[PDB]
Coordinates of C-alpha atoms and ligand atoms in Angstrom, one line a residue:
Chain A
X1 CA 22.5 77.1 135.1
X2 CA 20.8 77.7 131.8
X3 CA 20.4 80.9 129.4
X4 CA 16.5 81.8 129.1
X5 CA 15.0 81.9 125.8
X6 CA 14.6 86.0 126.5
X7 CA 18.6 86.3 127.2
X8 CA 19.5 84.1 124.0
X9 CA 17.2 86.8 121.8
X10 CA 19.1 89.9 123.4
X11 CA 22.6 87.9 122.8
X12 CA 21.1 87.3 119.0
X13 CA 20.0 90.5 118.4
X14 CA 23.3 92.5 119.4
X15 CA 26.0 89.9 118.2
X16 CA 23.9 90.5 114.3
X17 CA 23.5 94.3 115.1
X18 CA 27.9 94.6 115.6
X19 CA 28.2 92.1 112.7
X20 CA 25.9 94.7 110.8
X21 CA 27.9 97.5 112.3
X22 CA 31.4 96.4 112.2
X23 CA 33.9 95.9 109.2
X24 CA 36.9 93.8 110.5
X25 CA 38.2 94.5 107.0
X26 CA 38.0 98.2 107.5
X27 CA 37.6 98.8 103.4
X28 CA 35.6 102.0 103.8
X29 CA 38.7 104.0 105.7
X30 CA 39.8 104.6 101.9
X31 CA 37.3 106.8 101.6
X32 CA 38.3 109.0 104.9
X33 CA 40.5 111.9 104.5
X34 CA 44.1 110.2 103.6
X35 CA 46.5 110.4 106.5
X36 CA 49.3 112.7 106.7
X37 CA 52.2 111.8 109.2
X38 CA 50.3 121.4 112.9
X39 CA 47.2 118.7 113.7
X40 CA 48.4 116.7 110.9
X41 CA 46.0 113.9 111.2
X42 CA 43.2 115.4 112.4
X43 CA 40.9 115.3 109.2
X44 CA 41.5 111.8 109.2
X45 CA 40.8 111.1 112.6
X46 CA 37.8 113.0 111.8
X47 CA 36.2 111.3 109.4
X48 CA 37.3 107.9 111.5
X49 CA 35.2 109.4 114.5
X50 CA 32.5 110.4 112.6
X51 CA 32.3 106.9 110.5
X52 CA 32.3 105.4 113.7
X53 CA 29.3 107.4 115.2
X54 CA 27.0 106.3 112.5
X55 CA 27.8 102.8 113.4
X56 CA 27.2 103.1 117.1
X57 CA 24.2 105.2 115.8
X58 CA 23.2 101.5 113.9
X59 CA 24.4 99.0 116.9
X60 CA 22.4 101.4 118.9
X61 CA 18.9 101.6 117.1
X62 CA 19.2 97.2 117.2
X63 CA 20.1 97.1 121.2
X64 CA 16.6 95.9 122.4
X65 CA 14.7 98.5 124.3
X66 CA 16.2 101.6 122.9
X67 CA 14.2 102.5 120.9
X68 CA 11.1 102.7 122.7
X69 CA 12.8 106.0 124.3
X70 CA 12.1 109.5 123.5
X71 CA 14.2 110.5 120.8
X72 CA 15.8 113.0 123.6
X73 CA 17.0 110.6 125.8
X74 CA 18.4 108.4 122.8
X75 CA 20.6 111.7 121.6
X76 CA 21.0 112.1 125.2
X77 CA 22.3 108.6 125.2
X78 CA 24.5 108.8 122.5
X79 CA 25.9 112.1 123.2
X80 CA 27.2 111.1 126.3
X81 CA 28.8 107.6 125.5
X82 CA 29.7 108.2 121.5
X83 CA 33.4 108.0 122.8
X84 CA 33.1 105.4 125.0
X85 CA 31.9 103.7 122.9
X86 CA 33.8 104.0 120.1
X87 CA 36.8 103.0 122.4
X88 CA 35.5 100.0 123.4
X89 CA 34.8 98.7 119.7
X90 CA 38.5 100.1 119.0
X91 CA 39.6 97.0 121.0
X92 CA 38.9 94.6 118.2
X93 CA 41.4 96.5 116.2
X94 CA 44.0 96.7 118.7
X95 CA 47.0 94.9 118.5
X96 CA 49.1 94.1 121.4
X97 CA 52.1 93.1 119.4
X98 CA 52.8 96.9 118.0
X99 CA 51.0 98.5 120.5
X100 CA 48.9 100.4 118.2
X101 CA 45.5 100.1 116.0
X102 CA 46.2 98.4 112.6
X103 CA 43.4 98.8 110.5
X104 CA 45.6 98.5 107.1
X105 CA 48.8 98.6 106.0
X106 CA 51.3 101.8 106.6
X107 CA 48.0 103.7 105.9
X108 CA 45.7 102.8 108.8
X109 CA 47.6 101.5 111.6
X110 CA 47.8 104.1 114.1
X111 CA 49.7 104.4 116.7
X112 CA 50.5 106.6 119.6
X113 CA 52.1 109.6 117.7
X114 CA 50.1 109.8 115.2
X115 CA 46.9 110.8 118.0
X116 CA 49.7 113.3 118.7
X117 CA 49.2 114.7 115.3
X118 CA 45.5 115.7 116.4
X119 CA 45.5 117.7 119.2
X120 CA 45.8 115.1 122.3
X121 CA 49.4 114.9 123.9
X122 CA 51.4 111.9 125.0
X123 CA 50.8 111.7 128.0
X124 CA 47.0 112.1 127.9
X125 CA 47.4 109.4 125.6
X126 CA 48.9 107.3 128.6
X127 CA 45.4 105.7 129.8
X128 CA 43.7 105.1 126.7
X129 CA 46.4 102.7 126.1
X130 CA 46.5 100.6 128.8
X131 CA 42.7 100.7 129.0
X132 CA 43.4 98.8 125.2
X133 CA 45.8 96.6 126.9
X134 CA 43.5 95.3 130.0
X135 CA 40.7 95.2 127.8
X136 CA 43.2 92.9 125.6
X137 CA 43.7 90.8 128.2
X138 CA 40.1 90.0 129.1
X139 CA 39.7 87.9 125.8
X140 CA 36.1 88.5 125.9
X141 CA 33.6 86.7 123.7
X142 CA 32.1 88.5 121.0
X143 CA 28.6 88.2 123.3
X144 CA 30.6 90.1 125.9
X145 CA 32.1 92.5 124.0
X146 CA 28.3 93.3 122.4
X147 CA 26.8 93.1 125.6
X148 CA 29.3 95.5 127.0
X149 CA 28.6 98.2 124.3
X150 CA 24.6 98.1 124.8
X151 CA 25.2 98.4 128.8
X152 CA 27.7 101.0 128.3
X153 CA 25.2 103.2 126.0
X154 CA 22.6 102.6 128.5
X155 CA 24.0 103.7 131.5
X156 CA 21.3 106.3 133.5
X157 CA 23.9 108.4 134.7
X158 CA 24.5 110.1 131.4
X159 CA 24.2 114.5 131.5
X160 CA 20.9 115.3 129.6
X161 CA 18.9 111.5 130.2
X162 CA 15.5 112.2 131.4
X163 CA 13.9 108.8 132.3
X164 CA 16.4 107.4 134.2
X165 CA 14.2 104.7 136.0
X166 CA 14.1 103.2 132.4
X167 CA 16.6 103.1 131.4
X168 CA 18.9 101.6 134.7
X169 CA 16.3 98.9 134.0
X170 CA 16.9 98.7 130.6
X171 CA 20.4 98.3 131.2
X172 CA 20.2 95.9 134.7
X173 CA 18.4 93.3 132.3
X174 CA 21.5 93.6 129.9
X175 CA 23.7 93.2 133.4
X176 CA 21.6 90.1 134.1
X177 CA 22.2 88.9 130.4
X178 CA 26.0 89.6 131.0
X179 CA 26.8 87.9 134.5
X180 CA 24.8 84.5 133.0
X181 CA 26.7 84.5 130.0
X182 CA 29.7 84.3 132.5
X183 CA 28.5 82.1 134.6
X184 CA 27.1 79.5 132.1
X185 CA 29.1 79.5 129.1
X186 CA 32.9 81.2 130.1
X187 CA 35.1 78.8 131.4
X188 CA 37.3 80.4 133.9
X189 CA 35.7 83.5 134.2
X190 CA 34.5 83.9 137.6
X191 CA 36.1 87.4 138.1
X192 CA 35.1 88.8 134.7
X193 CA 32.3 90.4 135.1
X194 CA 33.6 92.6 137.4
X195 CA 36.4 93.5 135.8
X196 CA 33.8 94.3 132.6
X197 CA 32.5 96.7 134.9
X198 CA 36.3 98.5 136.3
X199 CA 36.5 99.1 132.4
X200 CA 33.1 101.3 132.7
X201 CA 34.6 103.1 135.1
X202 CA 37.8 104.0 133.5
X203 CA 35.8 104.9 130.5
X204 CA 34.2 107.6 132.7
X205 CA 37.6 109.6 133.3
X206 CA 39.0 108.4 129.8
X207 CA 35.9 110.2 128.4
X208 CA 36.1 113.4 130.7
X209 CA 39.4 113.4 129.8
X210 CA 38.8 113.7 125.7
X211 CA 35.4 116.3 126.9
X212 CA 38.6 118.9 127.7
X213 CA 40.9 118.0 125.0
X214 CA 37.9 118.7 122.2
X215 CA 36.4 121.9 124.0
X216 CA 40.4 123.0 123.0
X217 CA 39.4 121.7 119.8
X218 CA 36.4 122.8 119.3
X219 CA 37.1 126.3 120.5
X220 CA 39.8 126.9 117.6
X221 CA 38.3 127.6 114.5
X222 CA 40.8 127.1 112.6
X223 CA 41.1 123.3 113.9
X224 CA 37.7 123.2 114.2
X225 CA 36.7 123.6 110.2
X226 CA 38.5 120.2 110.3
X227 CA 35.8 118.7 111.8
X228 CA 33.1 117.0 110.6
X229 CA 29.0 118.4 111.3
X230 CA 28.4 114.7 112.4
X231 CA 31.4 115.2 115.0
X232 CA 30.1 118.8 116.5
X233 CA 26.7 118.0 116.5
X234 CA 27.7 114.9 118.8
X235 CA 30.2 116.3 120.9
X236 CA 28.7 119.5 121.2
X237 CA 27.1 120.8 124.2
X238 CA 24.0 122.2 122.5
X239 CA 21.2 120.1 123.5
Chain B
X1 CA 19.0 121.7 117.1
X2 CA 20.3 117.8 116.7
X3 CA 18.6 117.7 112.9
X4 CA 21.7 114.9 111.8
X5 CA 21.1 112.6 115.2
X6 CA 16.9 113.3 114.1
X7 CA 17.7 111.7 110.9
X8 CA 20.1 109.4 111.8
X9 CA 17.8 107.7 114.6
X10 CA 15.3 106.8 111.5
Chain C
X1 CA 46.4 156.2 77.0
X2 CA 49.1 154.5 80.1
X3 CA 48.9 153.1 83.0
X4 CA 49.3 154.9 86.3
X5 CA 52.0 153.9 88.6
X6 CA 48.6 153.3 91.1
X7 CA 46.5 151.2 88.5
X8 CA 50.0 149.0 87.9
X9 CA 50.5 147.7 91.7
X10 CA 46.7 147.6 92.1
X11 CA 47.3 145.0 88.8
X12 CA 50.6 143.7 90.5
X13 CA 48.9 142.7 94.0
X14 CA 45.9 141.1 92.5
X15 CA 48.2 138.6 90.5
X16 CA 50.2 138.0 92.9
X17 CA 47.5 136.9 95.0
X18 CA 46.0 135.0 92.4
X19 CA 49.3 132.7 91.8
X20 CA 49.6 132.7 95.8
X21 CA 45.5 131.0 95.9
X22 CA 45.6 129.1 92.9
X23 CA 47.5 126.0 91.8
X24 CA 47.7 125.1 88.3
X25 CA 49.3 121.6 89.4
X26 CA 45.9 120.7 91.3
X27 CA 48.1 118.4 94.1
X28 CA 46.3 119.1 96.7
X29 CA 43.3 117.1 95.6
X30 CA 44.3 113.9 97.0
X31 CA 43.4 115.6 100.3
X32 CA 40.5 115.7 99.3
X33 CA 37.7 112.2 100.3
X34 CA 38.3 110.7 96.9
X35 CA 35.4 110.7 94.3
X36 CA 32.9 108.0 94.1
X37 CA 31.2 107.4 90.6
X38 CA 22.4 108.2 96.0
X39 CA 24.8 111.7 95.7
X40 CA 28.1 109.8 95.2
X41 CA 30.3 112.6 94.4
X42 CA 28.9 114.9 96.9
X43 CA 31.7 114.4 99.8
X44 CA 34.5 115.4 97.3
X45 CA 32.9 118.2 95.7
X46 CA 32.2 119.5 99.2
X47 CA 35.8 119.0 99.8
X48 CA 36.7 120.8 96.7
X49 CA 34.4 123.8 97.4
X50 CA 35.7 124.1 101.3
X51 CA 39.1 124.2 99.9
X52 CA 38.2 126.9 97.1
X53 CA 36.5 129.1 99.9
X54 CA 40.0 128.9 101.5
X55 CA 41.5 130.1 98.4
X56 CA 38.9 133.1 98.1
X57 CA 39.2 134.2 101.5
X58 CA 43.1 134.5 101.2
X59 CA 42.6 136.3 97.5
X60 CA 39.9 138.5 98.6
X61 CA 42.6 139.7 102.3
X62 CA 44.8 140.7 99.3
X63 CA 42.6 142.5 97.4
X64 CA 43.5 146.3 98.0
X65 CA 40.9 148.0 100.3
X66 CA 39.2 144.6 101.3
X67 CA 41.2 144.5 104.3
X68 CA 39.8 148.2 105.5
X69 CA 35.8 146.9 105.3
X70 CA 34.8 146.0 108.8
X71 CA 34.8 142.3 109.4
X72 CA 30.9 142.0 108.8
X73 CA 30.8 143.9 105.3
X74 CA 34.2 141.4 104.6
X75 CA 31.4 138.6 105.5
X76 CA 29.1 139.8 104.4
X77 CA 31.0 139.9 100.5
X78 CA 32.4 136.8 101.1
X79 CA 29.1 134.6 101.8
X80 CA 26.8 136.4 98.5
X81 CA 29.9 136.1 96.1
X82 CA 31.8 132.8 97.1
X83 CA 29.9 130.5 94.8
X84 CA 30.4 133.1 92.0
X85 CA 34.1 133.6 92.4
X86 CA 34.5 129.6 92.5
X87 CA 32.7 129.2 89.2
X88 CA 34.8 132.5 87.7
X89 CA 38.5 130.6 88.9
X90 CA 37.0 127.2 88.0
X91 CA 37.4 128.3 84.1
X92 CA 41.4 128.3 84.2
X93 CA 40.6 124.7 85.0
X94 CA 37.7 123.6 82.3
X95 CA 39.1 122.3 79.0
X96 CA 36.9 123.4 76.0
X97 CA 37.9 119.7 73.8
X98 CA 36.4 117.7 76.7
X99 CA 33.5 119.9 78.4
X100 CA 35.2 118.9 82.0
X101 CA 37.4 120.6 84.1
X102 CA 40.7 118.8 84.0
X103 CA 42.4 118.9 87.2
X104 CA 43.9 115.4 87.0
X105 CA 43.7 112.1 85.7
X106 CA 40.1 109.8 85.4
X107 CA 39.7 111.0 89.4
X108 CA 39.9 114.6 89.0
X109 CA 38.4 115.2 85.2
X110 CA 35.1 117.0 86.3
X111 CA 32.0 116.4 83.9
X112 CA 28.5 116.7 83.9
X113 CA 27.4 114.0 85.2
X114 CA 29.9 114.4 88.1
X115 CA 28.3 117.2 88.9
X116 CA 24.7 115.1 89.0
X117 CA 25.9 113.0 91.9
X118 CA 26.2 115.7 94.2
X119 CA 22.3 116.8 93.9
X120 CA 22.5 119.0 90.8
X121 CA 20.2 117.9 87.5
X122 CA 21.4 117.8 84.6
X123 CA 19.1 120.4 83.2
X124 CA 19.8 123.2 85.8
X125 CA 23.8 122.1 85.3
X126 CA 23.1 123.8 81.3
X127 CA 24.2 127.3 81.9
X128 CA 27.1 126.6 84.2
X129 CA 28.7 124.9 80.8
X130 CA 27.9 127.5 78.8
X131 CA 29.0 130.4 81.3
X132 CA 32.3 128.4 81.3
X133 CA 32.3 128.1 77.5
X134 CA 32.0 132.1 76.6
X135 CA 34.1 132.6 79.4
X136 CA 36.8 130.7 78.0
X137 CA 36.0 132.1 74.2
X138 CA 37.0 135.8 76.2
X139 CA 40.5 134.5 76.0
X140 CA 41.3 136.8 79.7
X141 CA 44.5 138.1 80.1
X142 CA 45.5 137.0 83.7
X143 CA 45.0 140.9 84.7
X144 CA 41.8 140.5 83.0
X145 CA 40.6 137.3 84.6
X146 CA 42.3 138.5 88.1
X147 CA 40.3 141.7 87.8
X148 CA 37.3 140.2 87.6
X149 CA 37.4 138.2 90.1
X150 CA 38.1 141.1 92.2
X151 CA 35.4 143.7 90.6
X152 CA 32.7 140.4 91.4
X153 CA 33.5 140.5 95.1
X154 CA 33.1 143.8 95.6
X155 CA 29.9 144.0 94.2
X156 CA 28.1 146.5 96.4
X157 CA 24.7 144.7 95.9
X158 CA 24.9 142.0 98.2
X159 CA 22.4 141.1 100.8
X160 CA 24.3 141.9 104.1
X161 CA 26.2 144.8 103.2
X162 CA 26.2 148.0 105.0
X163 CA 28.9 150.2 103.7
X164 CA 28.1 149.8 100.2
X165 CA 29.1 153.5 99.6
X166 CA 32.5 152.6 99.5
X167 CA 32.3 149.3 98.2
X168 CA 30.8 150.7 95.1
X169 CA 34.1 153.2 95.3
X170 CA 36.5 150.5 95.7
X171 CA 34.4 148.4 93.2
X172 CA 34.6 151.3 90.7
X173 CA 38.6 151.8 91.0
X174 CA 38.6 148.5 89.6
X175 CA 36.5 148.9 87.1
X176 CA 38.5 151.6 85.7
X177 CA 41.7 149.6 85.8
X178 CA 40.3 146.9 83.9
X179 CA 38.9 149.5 81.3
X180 CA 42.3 151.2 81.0
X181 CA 44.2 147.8 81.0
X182 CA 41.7 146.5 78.0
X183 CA 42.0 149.5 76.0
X184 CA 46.3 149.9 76.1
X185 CA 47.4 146.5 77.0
X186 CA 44.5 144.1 75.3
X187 CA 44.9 144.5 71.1
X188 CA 41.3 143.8 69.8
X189 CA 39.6 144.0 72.7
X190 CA 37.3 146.9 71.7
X191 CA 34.7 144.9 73.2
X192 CA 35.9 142.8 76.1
X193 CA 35.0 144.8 79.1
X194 CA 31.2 144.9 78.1
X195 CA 31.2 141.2 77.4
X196 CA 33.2 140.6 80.8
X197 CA 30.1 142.8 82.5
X198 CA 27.9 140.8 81.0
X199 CA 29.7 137.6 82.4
X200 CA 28.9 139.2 85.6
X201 CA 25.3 139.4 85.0
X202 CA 25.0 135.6 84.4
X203 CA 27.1 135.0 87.5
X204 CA 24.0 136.8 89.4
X205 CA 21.3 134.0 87.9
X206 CA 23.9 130.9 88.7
X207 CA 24.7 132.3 92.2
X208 CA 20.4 132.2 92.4
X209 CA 20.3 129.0 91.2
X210 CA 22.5 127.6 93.0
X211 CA 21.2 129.1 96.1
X212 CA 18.1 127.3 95.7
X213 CA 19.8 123.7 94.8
X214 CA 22.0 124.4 98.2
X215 CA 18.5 125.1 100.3
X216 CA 17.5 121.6 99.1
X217 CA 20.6 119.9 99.8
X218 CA 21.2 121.6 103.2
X219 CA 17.7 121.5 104.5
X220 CA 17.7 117.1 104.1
X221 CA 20.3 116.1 106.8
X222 CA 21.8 112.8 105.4
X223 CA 23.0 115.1 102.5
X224 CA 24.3 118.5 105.0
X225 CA 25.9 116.0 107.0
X226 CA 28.3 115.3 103.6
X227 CA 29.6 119.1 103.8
X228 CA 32.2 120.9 105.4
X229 CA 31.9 123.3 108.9
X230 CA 33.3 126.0 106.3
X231 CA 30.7 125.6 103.6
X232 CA 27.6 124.9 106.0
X233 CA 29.3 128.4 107.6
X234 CA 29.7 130.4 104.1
X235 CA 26.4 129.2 102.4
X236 CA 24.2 129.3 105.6
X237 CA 21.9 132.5 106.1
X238 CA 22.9 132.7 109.9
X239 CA 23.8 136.2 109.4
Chain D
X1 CA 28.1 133.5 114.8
X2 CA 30.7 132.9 111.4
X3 CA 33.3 131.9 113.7
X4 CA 34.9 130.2 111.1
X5 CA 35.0 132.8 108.6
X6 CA 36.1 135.2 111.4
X7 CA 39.2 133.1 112.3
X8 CA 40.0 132.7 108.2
X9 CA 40.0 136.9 107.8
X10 CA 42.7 137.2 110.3
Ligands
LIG1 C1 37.2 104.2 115.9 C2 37.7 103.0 115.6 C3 39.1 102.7 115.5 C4 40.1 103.3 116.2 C5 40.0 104.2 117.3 C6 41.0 105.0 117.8 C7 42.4 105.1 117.3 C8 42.7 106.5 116.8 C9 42.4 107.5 117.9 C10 41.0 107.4 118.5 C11 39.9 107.7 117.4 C12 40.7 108.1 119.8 C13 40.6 109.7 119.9 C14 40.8 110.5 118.6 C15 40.5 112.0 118.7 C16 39.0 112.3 118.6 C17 38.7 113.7 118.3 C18 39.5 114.3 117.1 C19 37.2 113.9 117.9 O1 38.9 114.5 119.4 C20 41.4 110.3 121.1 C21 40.6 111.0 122.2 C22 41.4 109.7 122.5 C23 42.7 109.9 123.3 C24 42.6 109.6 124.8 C25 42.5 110.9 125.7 C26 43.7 111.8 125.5 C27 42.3 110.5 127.1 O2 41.3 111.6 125.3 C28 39.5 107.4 120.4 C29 39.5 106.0 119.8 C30 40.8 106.0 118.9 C31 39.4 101.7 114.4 C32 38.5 100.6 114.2 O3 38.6 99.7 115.3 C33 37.0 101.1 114.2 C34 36.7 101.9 115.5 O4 35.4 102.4 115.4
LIG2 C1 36.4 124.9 92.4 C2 37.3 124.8 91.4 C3 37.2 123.8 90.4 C4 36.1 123.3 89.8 C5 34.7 123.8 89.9 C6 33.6 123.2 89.6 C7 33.6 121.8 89.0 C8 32.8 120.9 89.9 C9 31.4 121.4 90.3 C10 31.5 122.9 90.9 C11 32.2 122.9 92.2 C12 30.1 123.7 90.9 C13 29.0 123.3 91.9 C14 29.2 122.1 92.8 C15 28.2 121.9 93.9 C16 28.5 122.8 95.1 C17 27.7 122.4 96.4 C18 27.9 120.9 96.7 C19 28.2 123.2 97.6 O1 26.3 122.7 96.3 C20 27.6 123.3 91.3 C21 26.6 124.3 91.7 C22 27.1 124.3 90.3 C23 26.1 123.9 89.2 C24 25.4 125.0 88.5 C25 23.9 125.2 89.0 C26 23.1 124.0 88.9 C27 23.3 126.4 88.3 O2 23.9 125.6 90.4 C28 30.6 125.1 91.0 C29 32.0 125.2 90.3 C30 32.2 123.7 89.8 C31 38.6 123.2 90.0 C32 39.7 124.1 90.0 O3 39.6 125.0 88.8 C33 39.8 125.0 91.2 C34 38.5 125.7 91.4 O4 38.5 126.5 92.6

């Protein structure tokens, strides 16, 4: 009925390494590619994606354990959950009131059609939504929301991971850290956790689903060169 | 190749 | 001592393509990520230079002959000669009061020590200025300037070409052009077509240098990651 | 490769 003195650290350590990786006042999206409302908004998008990997790249380096792996399985790691990721920490920007992402004023709030403008269609789009909306609902804590990420990143069955024992037990102690949390310190939570993991799951499909939309992408040249080296290197398949 | 995620990973 | 009807459309296609690649307004430099004043101003210059290759490509396609080359010598052109034909158009842009090239207000007034935050020194900057300043004393003609952009791309001494035969043929057509357009169209110009040869000389030692400043910069991945799929495509030697 | 530059020559 009590957090271990082990637990507490891991909560600690990824609760700073968000706060160190995470601007809830978004001031550095001025310095993106300005939106524009033929792929209209996909250099902006872009550089959002690609702004976003090197802060999953920084939450990532502080979850504990991760970087005792061989930098292969840590791009291998990476790689594979870069977009699940980055729509999990999305959440905190989500509104339920409009629907949309509002990171700033007309500029930055970003709604369905504007995704539109870079290469996905609306009803692609349908999922990615409502996974906002259900992960909405949840009102996680912030410890949840962290501890979500780092199990997320860690999962073994990722194309490319090589020691798989280690990391499943890297992430089962992160598990262990998330269904005491729960238990002990979220009032009326006593289905949570396993609705934290139905969202890992629909992240699954919702990422196979973008792996086909950017091979279209990625395949164009001309839509391509909007891109950003950061962006292939990470969602390219040449490991 | 990977030479950004190299760097990035410190 | 006139014109042929051949040597006037080869002048007419070259500035038409000229005005159709270059604006004298500079608006679409707000696309651009906005310039920052650790290599602050390298993500807009990278920006700048993508969009300039852009602006080649499409003048070069409209150059008459280019379009025959096979699409390796047409690469081949483009990747040894970009950087030179960017620092030839780059002139209708620098202001000779100020030292900078003016494309806008404070953001887009290009200076020296703009230039330093994007991995150049400021000694190795010196003969860029000074190429731009006897450039500008040649007071060109647009036919003049047009043409040597033009005679510069189809320099048959590139690394990579293989039908430099009738490069050098399509290279010299040119060349008589601007000779003939000199001597009946330029008053006082007795000299002009050796000076702009030697312009192109100079070209050869900046294009070096700045080949070896780009190795530097593309070689350290924090700073290639700042660049542009086109540029990392253009100045890489993955011939 | 020079996919890119491929696609921008038409
Ligand atoms: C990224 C963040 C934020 C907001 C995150 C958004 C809103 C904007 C659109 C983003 C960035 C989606 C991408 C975009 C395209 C990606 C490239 C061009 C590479 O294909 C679409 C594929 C997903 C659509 C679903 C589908 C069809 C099934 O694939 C993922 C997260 C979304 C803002 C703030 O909260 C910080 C946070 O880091
Ligand atoms: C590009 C244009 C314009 C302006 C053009 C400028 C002013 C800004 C700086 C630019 C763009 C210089 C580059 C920049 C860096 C390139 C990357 C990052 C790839 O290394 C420096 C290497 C040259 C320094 C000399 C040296 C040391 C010997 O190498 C070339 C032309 C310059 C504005 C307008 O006129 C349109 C025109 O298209």
């Amino acid at each position: 009925h009590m957090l271990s003195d082990e637990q507490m650290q891991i909560i600690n350590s990824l609760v700073e390494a968000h706060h160190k990786t995470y601007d809830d006042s978004y001031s550095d999206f001025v310095r993106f590619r300005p939106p524009v409302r033929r792929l209209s908004m996909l250099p902006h998008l872009a550089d959002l994606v690609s702004y976003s990997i090197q802060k999953v790249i920084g939450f990532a380096k502080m979850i504990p354990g991760f970087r005792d792996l061989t930098a292969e399985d840590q791009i291998a790691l990476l790689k594979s959950s870069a977009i699940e990721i980055i729509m999990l920490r999305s959440n905190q920007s989500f509104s339920l009131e409009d629907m949309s992402w509002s990171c700033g004023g007309p500029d930055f709030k970003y709604c369905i059609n504007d995704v539109t403008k870079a290469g996905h269609t609306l009803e692609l789009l349908e999922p990615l939504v409502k996974f906002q909306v259900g992960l909405k609902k949840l009102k996680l804590h912030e410890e949840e929301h962290v501890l979500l990420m780092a199990i997320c990143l860690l999962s073994p069955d990722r194309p490319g991971v090589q020691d798989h024992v280690r990391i499943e037990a890297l992430q089962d102690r992160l598990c262990d850290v998330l269904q005491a949390y729960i238990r002990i310190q979220h009032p009326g939570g006593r289905l949570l956790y396993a609705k934290m993991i139905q969202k890992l799951a629909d992240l699954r499909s919702l990422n196979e689903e973008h792996s086909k939309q950017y091979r279209s992408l990625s395949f164009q040249p001309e839509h391509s060169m909007q891109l950003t080296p950061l962006v292939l290197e990470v969602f390219g398949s040449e490991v | 190749r990977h030479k950004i995620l190299h760097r990035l990973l410190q």
